[PDB]
């Protein structure tokens, strides 16, 4: 329920943006979830959501490539 | 802007090395600040209502002139003409912000005077920075055998650094004690305007 | 399914850059636990070391402002009781300047500290100018009062 109030999600957005100067798979998942919630309320275009998902996918692949075969 | 004029003026004054970009930026900032900050009426003849008609630098320069080759002489002579406002009126006026601080389009004599003054400032700054750097190196002074293919022949000469320029600027800003003789014996902080060196 | 575009946007193809350690949990903890390309820490292989340079700094300044020191002597330019005073001076200066500058910056609605506030404080309270880091006129009432006074004078 904490994610339903507009003010609560606005407050959480500041924390999410604060921890994004060192992107990691989990932080990118949180950003993607935030973008999905924003889209659900007609506050964003689907194209930006797709772009966020693509960035997350690229980071995940890049991190998978660094482990042993 | 004016990086290359700065390089040429430094070369004229005794800096034969290759100073980095930070030195150029600092010197340009100093000159811009000074410029933006910037017989005779008060002669004895003016005491009356109605007038009537009438009727170590040199030594070093000479030594350097005697101690340079023909190609070095040609390069030195060609660089000696470096100027801040020689046939660059519009660019200088844009870089000096004439319109924002004064009525636009003054006479060209003012521009010539400004160029002369800027040349003098750069000359003095380089001459002092060289001494500061030399003293630092002299105090500081007191493993690869074989050889490569791109190794310099002898090296040994390095340009000046931003800290030397800053120290020289601090040294240039000091005023005479005649501007402080009226604060003797008190605890009053001295405050003044930028000094036009 | 999923919309695999015919061409990716510029944000996805980035050639990653070094990144710092953010989060606040701490670094170097030998316990149970990442960015693509973390930034290397700082290290020095061999040299004088900071513990010597920092101590020699004050003697360097004294040498600079003293004019020069002859051969066979250096370092002992300030007696033990004056070095403490100089260090106290430095600490007090730093603290006072920072305290003034932060409040001055917050006054004008800013949320970050910039060099301009420090420069303003130094210029207007200490007469210090550091290079290389980037009017008033009367109104009508004063003119009217001056005109009235001058007219009454004659």
Automatic annotation (TrEMBL), chain A:
It comes from the Eukaryota. Serine/threonine protein kinase which activates checkpoint signaling upon genotoxic stresses such as ionizing radiation (IR), ultraviolet light (UV), or DNA replication stalling, thereby acting as a DNA damage sensor. Recognizes the substrate consensus sequence [ST]-Q. Phosphorylates histone H2A to form H2AS128ph (gamma-H2A) at sites of DNA damage, involved in the regulation of DNA damage response mechanism. Required for the control of telomere length and genome stability. Belongs to the PI3/PI4-kinase family. TRA1 subfamily. Associates with DNA double-strand breaks. This is Non-specific serine/threonine protein kinase. The chain holds residues 2852 to 2920 of 3893 of the full protein.
TrEMBL record, chain B:
GO terms for biological process: regulation of transcription by RNA polymerase II; transcription by RNA polymerase II. The keyword Transcription regulation applies. It comes from the Eukaryota. It is found in: Nucleus. GO terms for molecular function: protein heterodimerization activity; transcription coregulator activity. Keywords: Activator, Nucleus, Transcription, Transcription regulation. Its main location: nucleus. Signal peptide: none annotated. GO terms for cellular component: nucleus; SAGA complex. Belongs to the SPT3 family. This is Uncharacterized protein. It comes from Chaetomium thermophilum (strain DSM 1495 / CBS 144.50 / IMI 039719). The chain holds residues 133 to 433 of 433 of the full protein.
Automatic annotation (TrEMBL), chain C:
Its main location: nucleus. Residues 55-128 form the Transcription initiation factor TFIID subunit domain. It comes from the Eukaryota. One of its GO terms (cellular component) is transcription factor TFIID complex. Keywords: Coiled coil, Nucleus, Transcription, Transcription regulation. GO terms for biological process: RNA polymerase II preinitiation complex assembly. One of its GO terms (molecular function) is TBP-class protein binding. It is found in: Nucleus. Belongs to the TAF12 family. This is Transcription initiation factor TFIID subunit 12 domain-containing protein. The lineage of its organism: Eukaryota, Fungi, Dikarya, Ascomycota, Pezizomycotina.
